[PDB]
Amino acid sequence: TSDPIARNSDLVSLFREVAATAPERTALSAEDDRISYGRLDAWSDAVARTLLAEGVRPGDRVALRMSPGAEAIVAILAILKCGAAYVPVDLRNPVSRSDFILADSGASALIGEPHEGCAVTRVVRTAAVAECKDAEAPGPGAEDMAYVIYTSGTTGNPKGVPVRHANVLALLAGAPSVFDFSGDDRWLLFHSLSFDFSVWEIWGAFSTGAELVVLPHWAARTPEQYLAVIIDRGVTVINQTPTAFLALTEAAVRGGRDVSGLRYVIFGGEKLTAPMLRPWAKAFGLDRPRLVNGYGITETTVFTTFEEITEAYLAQDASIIGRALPSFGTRVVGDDGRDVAPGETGELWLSGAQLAEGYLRRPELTAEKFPEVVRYYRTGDLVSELPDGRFAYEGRADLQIKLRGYRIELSDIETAVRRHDDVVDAVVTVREFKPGDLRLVCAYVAREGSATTARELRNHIKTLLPAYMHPARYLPLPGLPRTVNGKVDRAAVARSW
């Protein structure tokens, strides 16, 4: 085969082949500074020698604390070329999360700038990366780790997820079943290196010989700045949370921007419902760019299913995540541990080449979350199958509560609220009204240009759910408060109430 993706079994070999084949092509750009594949390849080789001198060796985990930028990408390639895995540290982490990630992962060095109180003292500064810029071992194998990304810590300590070269290759080999990507694309490098969206941005581009456009620091703050850069730099592929897309749409329409240079907008991270999509579709259509909903998790290498948005999508009121990539086997599993009848909701279980090998130093959790039956991963997500094989995303599987004599599926209530045409987000929790008097309440976000009242939402909910599932109060917020991992800050919602 001529295809470098099919022919290579690790990311370093893939990169080197793509670079050597056409090394003058642009791999990465920062403003007008264009770094060719050849330049990037030599630069990262020089940085790798620097890491070898700090003792980095195959199997090491090297911390990375940098903004997404050219230096950060060189540092990733350098770490990988040493046969090591990178452990990205979000610059905005609470100090305690960064402290835990570094202790947990046993990081033996850090590239970039250490956080305040950082226990890793073996450091290669950003300046030392820049110094290698224009200079002149077997490398990793399929089964070696490429990175360790940590889950958000919703349920307990952040879980460290080691992802292998073979895992990433399997995702990259699967992408062309949904996407038409080529070497002429320009991908915006946007997300924190600590998010696995970043992994997709980087390798989506490198695996096809495409260019990674770096979002400049000056443009990091507003969607107007964001649009200005993507349009000016000829970006063709962007990756967004549905929430970011709301603000993007609003800035594009109001600013009269031309978005039609984009070929794909790819969503991940959150439910995507039609009220979030209809205004873009109204202004711009669904062809240029194509919009593609994506569902995935760190444990199964970034993305699992995709659904390209169509007119039909806009005409229904659920979040449809679509069909699994070709590497995956799937089950939808009841509470008794057995499959469910097609059409009914159960826990999504996943099998295949994209599954990680388990958590880092968590034998107990790994046995639980990665059962043999064929090895599976339990997502902790509820889904239901459509009569095509497409999945609808229902909610998290751990949101059943006991209240006032009922078991209550909060995810069901959230889903019912999100069916409303003028709602774009919602979270249902329990709060105290009078001592010993706890009730369901719902904080929600109205779509731009609307103002749905508590009375109207109550009226909508009573057509869908039994009275024991009715939120007792509604609270309109300008947006839901979020954590650094973007997970909705439930301490903050409490305070809002």
Ligand X SMILES: Nc1ncnc2c1ncn2[C@@H]1O[C@H](COP(=O)(O)OP(=O)(O)OP(=O)(O)O)[C@@H](O)[C@H]1O
| Contacting residues toward ligand X, per CB under 6 A | 151-155, 158-159, 268-271, 295, 297-298, 321, 379-381, 393, 396, 485, 487
In the complex, the smallest distance separating the C-beta of residue 298 from ligand X, rounded to whole angstroms, is 5
Beta bridge partners of 248: none
Helix (H, G, I), strand (E, B) or coil at 176: helix
Whole-angstrom distance, CA of residue 474 vs CA of residue 59: 51
CA-atom Rg of the chain in angstroms: 23
Of the pair 41, 412, the CB lying nearest ligand X is at 412
The residues near 437 (Cβ < 8 Å, ≥ 6 apart) are: none
- CB-wise, 28 or 291, nearer to ligand X? 291
Instruction: Output 354 or 379, the one with its CB closest to ligand X.
Output: 379
DSSP β-ladder status, 290-295 and 305-308: antiparallel
Q: Which is nearer to ligand X, 60 or 409 (CB)?
A: 409
| Shortest distance, position 145 Cβ to ligand X, whole Å | 18
Nearer to ligand X by Cβ, of 286 and 484: the residue is 484
Please check whether residue 169 is in contact with residue 9, taking contact to mean a CB–CB distance below 8 angstroms: yes
Minimum CB distance to ligand X smaller for 211 or for 347: 347
The one-character DSSP state at 115 is P
Query: Which stretches within 82-125 are classed as H helix?
Result: 95-105
Nearer to ligand X, 108 or 151 (CB): 151
Residue closer to ligand X by CB (options 369, 447) is: 369
Cβ distance 480 to 145 under 8 Å?
Answer: no
Minimum distance from residue 347 beta carbon to ligand X (Å):
11
Q: Please, what is the minimum distance in Å from the beta carbon of residue 270 to ligand X?
A: 5
Q: How far is the C-alpha of 403 from the C-alpha of 202, rounded, in Å?
A: 46
Closest distance between ligand X and the C-beta of residue 268, in Å?
A: 5
Residue 97 CB, shortest distance to ligand X, in Å, is 11
Structure tokens at 82: 């040493």
The three-class DSSP label of residue 409 is strand
Q: Of 189, 287, 182, 295, which Cα lies nearest the Cα of 233?
A: 189
> What is the closest distance, in whole angstroms, from the C-beta atom of residue 485 to ligand X in the complex?
6
Closest approach of ligand X to the CB of residue 166, in Å: 20
Interatomic CA distance for residues 289 and 264, integer angstroms: 5
Query: What is the DSSP annotation of 308-373?
Result: E--HHHHTS-S-EEEEE-TTEEEEEE-TTSSB--TTSEEEEEEEETT--S--TT-HHHHHHHS-B-
